C-alpha cells in the first residue's frame, strides 16, 4: 500500500493538467514535484526580455474547461512570458492545485520495485515516497544546454542561459552579447537591442525567420473568438500542427510563379512561422522544389529589409527550410540599428571567452558586461537520462535508449510499468497545449481503467515500442525535417545520437492512434491483475 | 520483298553510325533521309556564334574506330560547331556514306503494313519506299520550339530560332535581343556580347552555370590522351554520364563545410557542368541538403563576379540545381560589359513583339535589329509525334503516348515491329556519342540476328515496355530531376505531358541492361521466323 496513488514530476502545462485529472476527476491521491521555485515550467524559467509564445494566444492555452475559455482575457496577439505565467498560476488557484504541488524539489531517482510493483521517488533533499503510478512531464525543452566554450568560466560579468534569466538583471545601458539565433535568441535580440548600449549577436547558423504579426487584440475580436471556441478547437484537434489556422491542401508547384509569390506574401503580411510552412502550401516540408520556393521568398525579403548587404549575406541562410519555423516582430529590421553588430561564427569562430568579453578568431576582443547563452536544450530525453530512472530487471532508461530515445505512442515505455510520459520521445510535433491534453486525457483513462479493474501493472511490449519507432521512422524519412541539423533530431549537442525523436504525422493522426489503441483493448499493452 | 533492307531517318551522330553498321559491316541495302540540306544534324542546324560542345572534345567523338582516334586532331578543350560539323563530314567521307544520305528530304509517313510486314515511308517530296527495318535517329533536340508570343511575326528585322541560325547573318554592330538562358542561350550570349553593338537578354529563368575551363589544348596532352584512349573509353563506358571524369563516391554532407567548399572550388577552377554535379559529390542530384550546398556555392560565385548587385540578384537562380548542367567561358562576367543588359521576364514579362523591338509589362520598348529565340526544342518525342507514325492495329504512336512517350530499352516500341530508335524515349542521359554507340551496335546485332535466322518481325511485348516505364519511373522519382520544370519532362512547352522520358541509371547500367536482354535470348522480344 503506497504513500500516494500517483506521483507527477514537473509543474509546466503538462504536470498541472495531469494533477487536475488524477486528483479532481479520478478522486485519487496525488503529489507533483517541481525542481523550480514556481509552477509554470517554461514560463517560470524564461524571464528574459522578449520571451513570448510563437503560437497565437487564442490557442496557446487549455480547452478542457469551457468556463475558463469564456472568462480568461488576453490583450495581445502573442502572449508575453509574465502573461502565460499568470494564466497558469490562475489555473493552479482555480482547481485548488497549489496545496499538492511541492516546489524547490528536484527528483534525483525514481525506481520501480518488481516485488511490490510500486514506484519509489527520491528527492534532492533525501526524502522518498511511494506511488502506484509515475507521470514524467519533464518537458521537451526543459534541460539547459550550455556548451563547454573555451574560457566560459573566466567571464567576470553576468553569464546566464536564457532558461535561468534572473528576475533582477537589467541590461539597460550595458554591453550585451548573445550566443544563439533560434526562436529564443531571435526574440531576445529584438527586445534586447531596444535596451543594451550595444548588442553583439554570435550567430553560427542563420534561420528562415518570418514576421509574427504581433500587436494588440481588439477586445471585440477576443469576444468573437470566445463565441466560436467550440469550432476553433475542433479545427485545432483535426489539424496537423494545431496553430488554429486552416492548413493548405495545395501543392506549391501546381500553380504559377505569380500565385506562389502572392500566397507566400499573404502569409508574410498575416504572420506566423507555422502559417508560412503549412498555411501557404501542403508540401513545403516534404517536396524540395516547394521548400526552395519558400526559402527563396524569405532570402529575397532579408535583402529588401537588411540595409548593409554584408549583414544581409550573414543573416541569409542557404541550407534547407526544415528547422522549426521562427517568427518575431521585426527581427531583420533590428540589424539596421547602429547599436547592433552581427558576428558570423562560420567566418570568425569564438577562440576564447576572457574575463572582459569574447575573443573571436579575427583577434577582436568583443567587450561585454552581460553574456547570454541562447544555446537551446538537451531536448526530449534531457531530464530522463539525467534521472536515475530504473524499471524492470533493475535497468536504467539509458540501457533502452542506445540507438536513440524511444516510447510506445509517445506516452509509455517498454519495461517501465505504470510510468506515463507527457511529451515523451516519439510524440507529436505541434502547438504543445492540445498535444499535452490528448496525452493527459489518454493517460487518465488508462490509470482510471487500472483503478476500476484492479490492475497492478500496465506496460507496453518491446514489440509495440519497436513497431512505433518504425512508424515514426517511416513518417520522418518522408519529410525534409531529418536534413536540418537542429535540436529536433538531437544533432545540436556534441556526442548525442542523430535519431528520430518525434511522430511527425500531426495531432489529427496522433489522437486517432491513441483512440484506436484504447478502443482496441489497449493494443500492444500487457494488463496484469 | 522491300525496296531497302533498312531506312535510317536523321544524318546526325545517330543516323551516320547506324548507316555505317548496316551497310559497310552487314552488307544490307540502306538509305538515310535528312530533312536538313547537309550531314551533322545538331551541328548542321546550330550554325550560331558560340555554338560549341559542353562535353570536352577528347570524348565528344566516336570510339569504335581505334585508327580514327589516333588520327583526327582537336586544338581546343571544347569543340566549336564548325569543328564538330567538319568531324562528322570526315566520318561521312571516311566510310563512303554520302551516296546513301538523301538531303532536304523530310519523311512525313511511317506506316507498318501488317500483311507484307514491311515499313512504307512517305517523304514530303512524294516518294514512298518499303523497308524491312526502320531506324529512327530523329534526335532528342532536333524540333525547334518557337513560342506563339503575341505579335511575333510583326517584327521588322531578323527573327530566328538558334537551331534555325542562317549562315548569312552577321550580328556585328547591331542591336541584338535573345529569349532563353539555357545551354544554347548562354553560350550565344558570351559570343554575341563581343560582336553586338548592344545585347538585350530576355531571361525568364536563370540557371546554375559553372565555368567550362575552355582554352587551347597542349598538343603534347592531345597525344598523351590518344596514348591512353583504350583506358579513357573504358572509364567512359563504366561511368553514368560518361564525360571522361572519375565520378565521386562521397556523400556531400558526410564531410565538413571547409571540405565541401574546397571540393566545389576545385571543380569550379577545373570547370565542366557535369563535373560540378557528379565530379564533386555522389548525391547532388538525389539529396536535397547536398543540392542546397551545391546551389549555394554557385549563388555566392554570381555575387563575387557580377558587379551590379541588381543584375547579380536577377542572374542568381533560386529553384533546384536539377536542370541539365550548363557551363560557359565567362558567362556571368559577360554582364559586367556596357553593351549588355538583363531583363527579368519574372518581373517585366513581354507584353507584345512590335516591328521595331519588344515591349515589356513596364511599358519599355526594347529596339532590336535581330531577335534570337534560344527557346529550345520539342525534346525526345518531338519529330515522332509530328510524324504520321502508325504500327499494329493501324494505331498512331500518340495513342501509345497519352501518359507520356514510351519504349522498351530506349531502342524499340510495342506495336512497332522492326522499328528501332537512336535515343528513343526512356534512353540514357549521358555524353551523347557513347550512348549512340551502345544503341547503334546493340541494334546492328539484333538486325544481324534477324537476317541469319530469317526472322520477319522483331518486336517488344506491351508488358516488357510497361515494365521499362516502371523501371525508368522508379529510378527517376528517386532523383531531384523530376522537380526541375525543364525540357527533360516535357514541361517546357505548354500542354505537353509532365512525364518521364529518360533512363537515369547511367551508361554503365544501360549497357549492362542491353547485354542482359541479348544474352537472355532477347527477354521481352517476340521473334517470328
Ligand atoms: C520562450 C518559449 C516560448 C514557447 N512558445 C511556444 C509556443 O508558442 N507554442 C508551442 O507549442 N510551444 C512553445 N514553447 C515550447 C514549450 O516548452 C511548451 O509550449 C510548453 O511550455 C511545455 O510544457 P511542459 O509542461 O511539457 O514542459 P515544461 O514547461 O518545460 O515543464 C517541465 C518542468 O519539469 C521540471 N523538471 C524536469 N526535470 C525534473 C526533475 N527531475 N525533478 C523535478 N522537476 C523536474 C522542470 O524544471 C520544468 O519546470 C515555448 C518555449 C519557450 C522557452
Ligand atoms: C557534350 C554534348 C554537347 C552538346 N552540345 C550541343 C550543342 O552545342 N548544341 C545543341 O544543339 N545540341 C548539343 N548537344 C545535343 C546533341 O543533339 C547530341 O549530342 C547529338 O549531337 C545528337 O545527335 P543525334 O544523331 O542523336 O541527333 P541530331 O544530331 O539532332 O540528328 C537528328 C536529325 O534527324 C533529322 N530529322 C528529324 N526528323 C526527321 C524527319 N521526319 N525526316 C528526316 N529527317 C528528320 C533532323 O533534321 C536532324 O538532322 C550536345 C550533347 C552533348 C552530349
Ligand atoms: N522558444 C522555444 O524554444 C525552442 C528551442 O529554441 P532555442 O532558441 O531555445 O534553441 P535552439 O533552437 O536549439 O537554438 C540554439 C541556437 O544556439 C546556437 N548554438 C548552440 N550551441 C552553440 C555553440 N556551442 N556555439 C555557438 N552557437 C551555438 C545554435 O546554432 P546552431 O544551429 O549552429 O547549433 C542556434 O542558433 C523552440 O522550439 C521554441 O518553441
Ligand atoms: N546546347 C544543348 O541544347 C540542349 C537544350 O538547350 P536549349 O538552350 O536549346 O534549350 P532549353 O534548355 O529548353 O532552354 C530554353 C530557354 O528558353 C526559355 N523559354 C522557353 N520558352 C519561353 C517563352 N515562351 N518565353 C520566354 N522564355 C522562354 C527557357 O526559360 P524557362 O526555363 O522559363 O522555360 C529557357 O531559358 C542542352 O541539353 C544542350 O546539350
Ligand atoms: Na493548424
UniProtKB/TrEMBL annotation, chains A, B:
Keyword terms of this UniProt record: FAD, Flavoprotein, NADP, Nucleotide-binding, Oxidoreductase
Binding site for NADP(+) 2: 181, 184, 204-205
Residue span(s) of domain FAD/NAD(P)-binding: 5-209
UniProt cross-references to InterPro entries, sorted A to Z: FAD-binding_Monooxygenases, FAD/NAD-bd_sf, FAD/NAD-binding_dom
E.C. designation(s): 1.14.13.22
GO MF terms held by the record: cyclohexanone monooxygenase activity; nucleotide binding
Binding annotation for NADP(+) 1: 52, 54, 181, 183-184, 187, 204-205, 324, 487
Residue numbers binding FAD 1: 14, 34, 42-43, 45-46, 54-55, 60, 107
Binding site for FAD 2: 14, 34, 42-43, 45, 53-55, 60, 107, 324, 432
Protein name, as recorded: Cyclohexanone Monooxygenase from Thermocrispum municipale
